[PDB]
Amino acid sequence: INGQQYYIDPTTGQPRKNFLLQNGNDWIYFDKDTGAGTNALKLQFDKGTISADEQYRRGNEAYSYDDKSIENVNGYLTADTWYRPKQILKDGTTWTDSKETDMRPILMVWWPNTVTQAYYLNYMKQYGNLLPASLPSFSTDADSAELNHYSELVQQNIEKRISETGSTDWLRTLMHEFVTKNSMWNKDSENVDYGGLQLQGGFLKYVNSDLTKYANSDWRLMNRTATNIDGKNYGGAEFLLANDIDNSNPVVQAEELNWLYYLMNFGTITGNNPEANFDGIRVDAVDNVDVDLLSIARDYFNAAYNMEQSDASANKHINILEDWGWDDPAYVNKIGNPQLTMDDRLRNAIMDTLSGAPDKNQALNKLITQSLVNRANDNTENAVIPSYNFVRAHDSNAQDQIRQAIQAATGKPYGEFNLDDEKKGMEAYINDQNSTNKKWNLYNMPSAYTILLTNKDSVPRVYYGDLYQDGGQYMEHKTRYFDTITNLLKTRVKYVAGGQTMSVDKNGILTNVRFGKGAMNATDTGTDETRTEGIGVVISNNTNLKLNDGESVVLHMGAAHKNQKYRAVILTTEDGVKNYTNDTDAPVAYTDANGDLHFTNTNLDGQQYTAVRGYANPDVTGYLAVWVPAGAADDQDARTAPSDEAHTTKTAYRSNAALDSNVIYEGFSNFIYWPTTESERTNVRIAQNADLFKSWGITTFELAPQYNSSKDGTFLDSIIDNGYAFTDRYDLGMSTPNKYGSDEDLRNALQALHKAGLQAIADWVPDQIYNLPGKEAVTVTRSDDHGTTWEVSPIKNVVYITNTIGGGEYQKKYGGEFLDTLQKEYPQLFSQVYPVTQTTIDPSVKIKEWSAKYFNGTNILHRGAGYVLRSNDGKYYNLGTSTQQFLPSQLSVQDNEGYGFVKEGNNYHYYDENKQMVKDAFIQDSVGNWYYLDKNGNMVANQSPVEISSNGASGTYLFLNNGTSFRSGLVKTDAGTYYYDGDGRMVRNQTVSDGAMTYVLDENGKLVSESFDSSATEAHPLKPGDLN
């Protein structure tokens, strides 16, 4: 009984918020907070008179407008501002001239309106006991004489408590707790939304303004990715996470080169050790930065390593791209393949045919065609775009599914967890991994890895979490796939080479063949070394596969393999798979004179598990078998060395037998735990295991990003501290260990890898920086991940407090410091003109500390739309440093009386700063609502649509009973339902999205249909193909 009322939306099953229901002259407004219905709106525009008591009035004035007198950010005041008054009412009794240290909250003496003053009183009473807790609530409607009486009493009681406790800490805490309970001062006014790449619930893009000139930029060219160089197209999302670096600013670009050089010379610079440098880069978040960076990195590598000279030259520095967009490969190829594109068409073919559940996988035929490379008869070299490929990665079918397991095991929201939670989720995740029916883990990991590692024209990348359990100390526990995948890896070195043929038969069974080194076509007879090389693969994704009697699967081993003995590498069993790491006790099969192997529904020569049929177990759902020639020498190596012959084209990597001889190891998971001893340190264990990785044929070890985590908990990366979320770009376990160890552990890992003949990859992360400690006022607009204005947000060209100043001691020590050396050693880098900026990089300014001018924007910070304090008509308070000096009445000697919104008779008027009545104009109140004063200067409030032209612009508006322009919501009337946009104007004849909601309005503005996208409402796994 006695509950609230709501209007349940038919598509959300939840209350409509900010929704007006009208029936004749009667109405219910359903509120913003919970959608609870009311028919009594409060007047929001009322200030009410300053202290009539002159001792309070004069005593509470600001001592001065100096920086030290009034807490501020670039001269702007915030809800948290404390200030020095002329006098304090000491111990509640004795007006006393203030000391410099006598700071008091501005909210002790000032409120944006009477609504907030009443709420302040209620709060200070209930939670501060600064009024008798017995008092009834102050209604918004309370007159200013009553409100002022009780805020003066609160002031007395604050001063008594300051005297009795000898402290103001309690008051700092209490006032900030009040602040955060006001929607104008919290996330409720920030239009939280998780659509697209709003991973943290929304962005604020930085814009130029006379209000914040020190934060202006001539650059901020956004979304300028591979398919949007000129900005005339859509491009990738500029915005992703945290503070988005403006990589279109030429000074920032020089700094990215500076950092790049630092990474590539890390051991030299920090350890006097040229044996402890990185050899290549991974470019993080490619489709979220100015694509100029690909050419800047290219140019540096060309200058320092002469990449384009030959294959031997390029292959000494394997670089890779995190480039998700399906049109990226053509562009990467065009600029010279300076970093390897991924082949996302190929990975998605694997996802679609092998990695899903039995009732979900598609026909295997797609593996032949859906890729940068057609593999039906891949018999040529240097003919395709070179690329790398993978089955999983730290952020690909790992982090989202692991968070799903944690959520399932703990009941906590997606992404929220402590270390105990993480371990409990990991136990469930690993139990799932070892099940036949998997909820969170990919199926057919053995078959997926077989395709990965036997494909021609591909640099495969192995994922750490497929060899070792994702969560645990580094390499603490092996997965069930460790033996299978390391068997494939060693077999790949020894046998996998030459041409490829892939086919799928009428039973949907896939056959994959490699001929061995020296043979490219099925008809080639090969060389001496070809004979005991090559591989044959049989794959099905059909758990019910049954061949009729007399039906066979034929592997066409080719003309180099006539009348030859083969032995098994992997066979599928009832319970899993069997691995054979060499010829000993492996089952055998013989080719005929055409080079064909013949398998059927029956074991060959009484050898267990040589029949082809469907299985369903935790390894295989379908069928897998792999065969190689018997009798290879123990030291057989089918790989090809890169030629040092001069390139005839302007390319680094070429897709050929030498590039194919490389394997990348992504040597981390996000869910590595912090080590409990020095011995458990990831980089310590990497150094100790260099020869192990070599034995798998790893040629480049991709290390995690080594940057010390911000540990701010604002994204997964700064919860599990993987190194992608950092404040100091140059701090690689240097001020304190990273999760992987100290900078000495890192240099030791690089040196040990080099000693074993492996390369090491530096994760280059130019997109963003986290957790800068210095505040800066910036003019911003709430925007989507492409910087498109969020139409329903009031945050449009609004001053907001950002955290953009800082960068740590190592950015300060090293930022810009290698530019002079780079200019003298590689001068050509400084005269290149880049395609997006159409200019050179700009090394004339060193970045030693970041500030807002260098960023495109920020994730929303939950400070609230109105945190920066304003009066009526959009006017900002300011000390006078960033914009016109203007202080609240209570702090100045100016009297508020008769200015702003004023009642006369049954009407309200608005008087401007010259005390003149405003007519036929829109005017904003201090908390951001909008009003229209008509031709007579009367506030409009008739809740029936009204046509207004304001500066040659039509609009149909609706003004609620309290005068406020209704906006960003629906109105249901007797005649239909209507939608008013973020500017208060009725929408007609279109489809509009309002956050999670989509509404279709006909020519008359009537709602025809609506839909709900729940994923806009909270953090969520990113949908497959979201980023293609």
Site string for Ca ion, 628-647 (x = CB under 5 A): --------------------
Task: Output the smallest distance, CB 448 to Ca ion, in A.
Answer: 32
Q: Distance between CA 842 and CA 830 in Å, rounded? A: 8
Which of 244, 308, 344, 702 is the binder for Ca ion (CB under 5 A)? 244
Q: Distance between CA 215 and CA 990 in Å, rounded? A: 37
Closer CB to Ca ion, residue 289 or residue 836?
289
Return the residues of window 87-116 that contact Ca ion according to CB under 5 A: none
Assigned token pair, 656: 């050929």
Closer CB to Ca ion, residue 224 or residue 782?
224
Instruction: Please tell me whether residue 250 adopts helix, strand or coil conformation.
Output: helix
Closer CB to Ca ion, residue 288 or residue 889?
288
Task: Output the smallest distance, CB 237 to Ca ion, in A.
Answer: 8
Return the residues of window 938-957 that contact Ca ion according to CB under 5 A: none
Task: Output the smallest distance, CB 240 to Ca ion, in A.
Answer: 6
Contact window for Ca ion (CB under 5 A) among 76-84, 108-116, 234-242, 619-627: 234-242
CA dihedral (351, 352, 355, 360) positive or negative? positive
Write phi, then psi, for 737 (nearest 5 degrees): -60, 145
Return the residues of window 746-805 that contact Ca ion according to CB under 5 A: 767
Task: Output the smallest distance, CB 717 to Ca ion, in A.
Answer: 15
Q: Where are the strands (E) in 557-662, listed by range? A: 565-572, 577-579, 588-590, 596-599, 615-616, 621-629
Contacts of 887 (CB under 8 A, 6+ apart): 62, 65, 70, 877, 879
Return the residues of window 137-166 that contact Ca ion according to CB under 5 A: none
Tell me the Cα Rg of the chain: 34
Query: In this structure, what DSSP letter does residue 642 have?
Result: P
Per rule CB under 5 A, count of chain residues that contact Ca ion: 5
Contact window for Ca ion (CB under 5 A) among 60-68, 117-125, 287-295, 718-726: 287-295
Task: Output the smallest distance, CB 256 to Ca ion, in A.
Answer: 12
Contact window for Ca ion (CB under 5 A) among 242-250, 590-598, 642-650, 999-1007: 242-250
* Strands, sheet with 768-769, edge to edge from the N-terminal-most edge strand: 768-769, 243-245, 855-859, 203-206, 774-783, 798-805
Site string for Ca ion, 402-441 (x = CB under 5 A): ----------------------------------------
Q: How far is CA 791 from CA 49, 191, 195, 784, 981, in A?
A: 36, 10, 14, 10, 7
Instruction: Please tell me whether residue 843 adopts helix, strand or coil conformation.
Output: coil
Task: Output the smallest distance, CB 437 to Ca ion, in A.
Answer: 40
Q: Using CA atoms of 502, 505, 509, 511 in order, give the dihedral in degrees to the nearest 10.
A: -30
DSSP characters for 993-1028?
A: EETTEEEEE-TTSBEEEEEE-GGGGS--PPPTTTT-
Task: Output the smallest distance, CB 714 to Ca ion, in A.
Answer: 17
Contact window for Ca ion (CB under 5 A) among 232-240, 437-445, 650-658, 844-852: 232-240
Single-letter residue type at 773: P
Cβ(672)–Cβ(336) below 8 Å: no
Which of 288, 353, 682, 889 is the binder for Ca ion (CB under 5 A)? 288
Closer CB to Ca ion, residue 287 or residue 745?
287
For residue 238, state whether it binds Ca ion (rule: CB under 5 A): yes
Q: Distance between CA 901 and CA 883 in Å, rounded? A: 24
Task: Output the smallest distance, CB 251 to Ca ion, in A.
Answer: 16
Three-state SS annotation for 477-539: CECCCHHHHHHHHHHHHHHCCCCEEEEECCCCCEEEEECCCCCCCCCCCCCHHHCCCCEEEEE
Q: Distance between CA 834 and CA 841 in Å, rounded? A: 8
Contact window for Ca ion (CB under 5 A) among 235-243, 557-565, 710-718, 989-997: 235-243
Q: How far is CA 226 from CA 33, 230, 235, 292, in A?
A: 42, 10, 7, 9
Nearest to 204, CA basis, from 770, 878, 994, 865: 865
Contact window for Ca ion (CB under 5 A) among 264-272, 283-291, 295-303, 422-430: 283-291
Annotated binding residue 238: yes
Closer CB to Ca ion, residue 763 or residue 767?
767
Chain CA centroid to CA 254, Å? 24
CB atoms within 10 A of CB 751: 19
Return the residues of window 484-523 that contact Ca ion according to CB under 5 A: none
Closer CB to Ca ion, residue 235 or residue 723?
235
Cβ(317)–Cβ(759) below 8 Å: yes
Return the residues of window 343-372 that contact Ca ion according to CB under 5 A: none
Annotated binding residue 244: yes
Task: Output the smallest distance, CB 228 to Ca ion, in A.
Answer: 13
Write phi, then psi, for 467 (nearest 5 degrees): -100, -40
Angle between helices 419-433 and 399-410 (to 10 degrees): 110
Contact window for Ca ion (CB under 5 A) among 111-119, 230-238, 372-380, 472-480: 230-238
Contact window for Ca ion (CB under 5 A) among 280-288, 445-453, 636-644, 938-946: 280-288
Closer CB to Ca ion, residue 342 or residue 765?
765
Return the residues of window 20-39 that contact Ca ion according to CB under 5 A: none
Q: Distance between CA 110 and CA 104 in Å, rounded? A: 11
Task: Output the smallest distance, CB 819 to Ca ion, in A.
Answer: 23
Contact window for Ca ion (CB under 5 A) among 233-241, 754-762, 911-919, 950-958: 233-241
Task: Output the smallest distance, CB 704 to Ca ion, in A.
Answer: 21
Tokens 């911000």: give the residue: 710
Closer CB to Ca ion, residue 296 or residue 467?
296
Pairing of strands 596-599, 768-769: unpaired
Closer CB to Ca ion, residue 580 or residue 726?
726
Site string for Ca ion, 714-753 (x = CB under 5 A): ----------------------------------------
Task: Output the smallest distance, CB 485 to Ca ion, in A.
Answer: 35
Contact window for Ca ion (CB under 5 A) among 284-292, 419-427, 501-509, 824-832: 284-292
Closer CB to Ca ion, residue 61 or residue 238?
238
Task: Output the smallest distance, CB 1025 to Ca ion, in A.
Answer: 21
Task: Output the smallest distance, CB 252 to Ca ion, in A.
Answer: 11
Closer CB to Ca ion, residue 18 or residue 288?
288
Closer CB to Ca ion, residue 190 or residue 767?
767
Task: Output the smallest distance, CB 804 to Ca ion, in A.
Answer: 15
Alpha helical stretches, state H, 656-771: 657-660, 682-688, 690-695, 743-755
Contact window for Ca ion (CB under 5 A) among 90-98, 286-294, 786-794, 902-910: 286-294
3-state helix, strand, coil in the chain (%, to 5): 25, 20, 55
Closer CB to Ca ion, residue 238 or residue 925?
238
Closer CB to Ca ion, residue 380 or residue 789?
789
Closer CB to Ca ion, residue 286 or residue 887?
286
Q: How far is CA 197 from CA 241, 434, 662, in A?
A: 8, 32, 33
- Residues flagged as binding site for Ca(2+): 238, 244, 288, 767
Residues lying near Ca ion in the complex (CB under 5 A) are found at 238, 244, 288-289, 767
- Residues flagged as binding site: 238, 244, 288, 767
